[PDB]
């Protein structure tokens, strides 16, 4: 299952669909509709379409209706009649969407064409979000996308993470179980494979390819710091050099300057960094300072 | 019949949110406001007056 | 039962029907009708149709009537006279729909044509939603849709989830119990089967096909995180690499940097992640940071 | 893994993408929209695009919508259809982005061209930041960049830190396992390697090169001081000379002038500096004064 | 390591770069923007570049 988990097929991709709708059946937790004119305007549009023309000059003050935006993913090779999941998010001053029902909503693409029609019952968790829900199989595909799959004798596998070693390894793995010249790497992120002419032939070839297992090679040393959530993650290839670290309210347990032992593997790094007795908030600053000095032999990314 | 013609070059970043731009933000502004019919013909100087306006000594 | 649970038949699909109606018989828990003019307007329309013309200038202040939207699904091969379930959702400032009765409601399609007529008694749970109910067999089909089923010698089975391996596996399964060239995969999501010319012949063929069992192949490794409900779900094909994790108020039980053991199967992953002693809210951030670093060898989806 | 962790390939670089979007589905923690007119203006733009034209003169006072800026990295050799992570940051007076959903956002480059389309669910930690979140695989690449990779017979490895010794060492390492004249150093930061003509040939060559291990040579002596976080980090090559240090409220434990023993290695430096009994805030001033005097034989950097 | 720690090479030097930017995503801890007009002016510039004319 390595090749499918590492790469993606060229032309097999997911698009994004968006639309506007109304959610009805709320227990008095909808829009105020005095500060969100589009809710009442679109309700009047729906009624006018259905055969009820409400007078232009009138005051409608609803409480069970909310104006929402619906987002979905158009899956690869989607055919009309299939169903997809949608996400429903409130748009103006609505308290909750607990037990609402999404009315008929056309999901447009980037090209402003309807690719799906959405309508269903929203499932809201019930510290849980109240203005956001999900409808499983809530939208039906109405339009299909032409594709070039099955045409030509080349298929590109696109690596999720760029690596010359991994690209070469996938090339050598495809060229071991599937013939001599069945794959050629084009760059650090693309492996071009030669496929038989046809549609089912390429499907069979890619089915074979996808479940093959490749031995993942060492992949860069990096320390990911998320300051907004206060988390630090170090992969296996992170090392350290011997150097001294000082920080506020931290001391040898006896001065404030603690020596960090050079470290070869990740267990040594973890032990050396835990010897400092540093909170992760302090550990982030320690890692940044060590990266500046040169003790930390890894790529420090702040996400 | 009245004709109002306009031409020019508009920088897109000057266009407001309502897809509108004042005429003073158009580089090569060519604005024309003309008309025809006897109402317009009544505002043209007579050929003899238009000649005396150019060739009379004073 | 695998093929029916995995695929859908081309042309065998469900449509969405919508309509507007009135719910009567409520115990003073209907619209205020002073802020929802359409309720009184449509009640006057109904009375005028029935033979009662209420004066235009008058004040009607009802309490047992609510204006509702009715939604239903038009089932495949629906024939006139059959019954379907409908969902009734209040539209404006109604307190409840406890024991109301849905009056005659025409359910329109996308093409604004009446496909069903809805009328019945609403069942409301009774923390339960009060403005939303369901009527079983509450609508009768009045229009039928022409279809191309039974015409031609090709039928497309559309996979619910795109997979070249699964498409090839279904193709090989249909071509084992139903002849040599009975199925051909067209893409990652479509399997074209050759069916006899006729209507009952295709029904028999698809009845045979649908209950066949296919051996489901490994299907991608993915971690689904629902932040709105605070849930994390990992399938069997999720693995881990050895790396160090630090987060606020979490420590080895002795520093704040805890080593996560490489993990091959899902039990190892669960044990390694439970060794951190992390709340799911913290676990979501841990998983996101590990995906950024590269320890988490899976596809992280946020739903 | 040394060469990949020390250098970068010429032309294999990451770009920065930026865009503006709206986040919907917040639990009343969006913009006030009375002090941020662009939120309502862009919401009206979205509705007008979707087919709803709200009157120009009207008051919309939303609470579940926030105007945000989305930032992402365009990875090397990115192909259309692939997915990247994005960072979503609020732009005006929004309380939180806890469970919001990012609507369709075009990520522009420096050249103001759309290279990715962003839409997904935001993951906010939950002392955690509330107006900043991250969406994994939240953007899909829509444009590709032409490159010169595979053209020519020269490839430049660019050292992360400039060093003539390290450049020469990498040159000698490449020229030991890959032929006599396979690499030539051009300056303190660049090593030019000779690669075969072709595209897959260069991929194979760089795959070989990247995982080679080079013996890292002593790399300058420097003391990094971060006064904003109050941290001091010294690498292994920092030494000391014998000199006397005096500072407020510090005394020999018996005068106020403490002799610091000359020190050759880093352990001696740590012991000598801990003998002073100095808080890191005092230690920063001590190190600066010693650098001024000449005891500290290292490069003092203030970050 | 003495010569590198004592000297520097001619022409091998570091320059200084400066720029102006905006920082977004703060938890209500940004500028007041009523006393710092350049913050709002440059935000409007960014929006106008991105296609929104306030």
UniProtKB/Swiss-Prot annotation, chain B:
Highest taxon of source: Bacteria
Subcellular location(s) per record: Cell outer membrane; Bacterial flagellum basal body
Record family assignment: Belongs to the FlgH family.
Reported function: Assembles around the rod to form the L-ring and probably protects the motor/basal body from shearing forces during rotation.
Known partners and oligomeric status: The basal body constitutes a major portion of the flagellar organelle and consists of four rings (L,P,S, and M) mounted on a central rod.
Protein name, UniProt field: Flagellar L-ring protein
The organism of origin for this protein: Salmonella typhimurium (strain LT2 / SGSC1412 / ATCC 700720)
Gene: flgH
Residues represented out of the complete protein: 175 to 232 of 232
Curated annotation (Swiss-Prot), chain E:
Subcellular localization(s) per the UniProt record: Periplasm; Bacterial flagellum basal body
Highest rank taxon of the organism: Bacteria
Family: Belongs to the FlgI family.
Complex formation: The basal body constitutes a major portion of the flagellar organelle and consists of four rings (L,P,S, and M) mounted on a central rod.
Task performed by this protein: Assembles around the rod to form the L-ring and probably protects the motor/basal body from shearing forces during rotation.
Name of the protein in its database record: Flagellar P-ring protein
